Design a binder for this molecule. Structure first.
Ligand SMILES: Nc1nc2c(ncn2[C@@H]2O[C@H](COP(=O)(O)OP(=O)(O)O)[C@@H](O)[C@H]2O)c(=O)[nH]1
Ligand SMILES: [Mg+2]
Length: 170
């Protein structure tokens, strides 16, 4: 089969994980989607000339059993850590997601991208400078997205793929 990249979208409820995933996969903005639904989506894409499959888990938080969380984190190759630029708590929550993924994968080298979503809104509590500082501290890219307008969306996911490639070549 063509190469598959197993991506996982994490972040607080309300940041736009589902909207980002559906915009990536289907090229439409779904502005109401139950925050408690967790599902995987697939799309065949071309990234830097490589035809590949993205297998994307749109997470929704706690699981029936924590073992289910640990399972998807171990299976997942790269993580989109999403906050909303107008929600400081969601940004603070990134610290927890960063830690939890590393802790489960038992790794200090996990492909991730920091995503600040909802960039179409003028309302903002997290300045780009602050988000860049966090991404720098993690050694990962930072991308601002709007799932609403699709700005930055392919970049966020394709950049994550490129981070996975960097990890795999070691
Ligand atoms: N303006 C704007 N609203 C967004 C964006 N992404 C998501 N939303 C809205 O934010 C809310 C939460 O989005 P959702 O995708 O359900 O977030 P999730 O809980 O992280 O899956 C919904 O009201 C969406 O319409 C965005 O980029 N811009
Ligand atoms: Mg959702």
């Amino acid at each position: 089969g063509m190469t598959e990249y197993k991506l996982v979208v994490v972040g607080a409820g309300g940041v736009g994980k589902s909207a980002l995933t559906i915009q990536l996969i289907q090229n439409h903005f779904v502005d109401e989607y139950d925050p408690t639904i967790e599902d995987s989506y697939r799309k065949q894409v071309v990234i830097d000339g490589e035809t590949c499959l993205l297998d994307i888990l749109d997470t929704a938080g706690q699981e029936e059993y924590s073992a289910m969380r640990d399972q998807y984190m171990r299976t997942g190759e790269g993580f989109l850590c999403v906050f909303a630029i107008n929600n400081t708590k969601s940004f603070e929550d990134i610290h927890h997601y960063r830690e939890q993924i590393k802790r489960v994968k038992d790794s200090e080298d996990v492909p991730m991208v920091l995503v600040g979503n909802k960039s179409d809104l003028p309302s903002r509590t997290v300045d780009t400078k602050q988000a860049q500082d966090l991404a720098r501290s993690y050694g990962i890219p930072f991308i601002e997205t709007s799932a609403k307008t699709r700005q930055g969306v392919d970049d966020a996911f394709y950049t994550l793929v490129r981070e996975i490639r960097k990890h795999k070549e070691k």
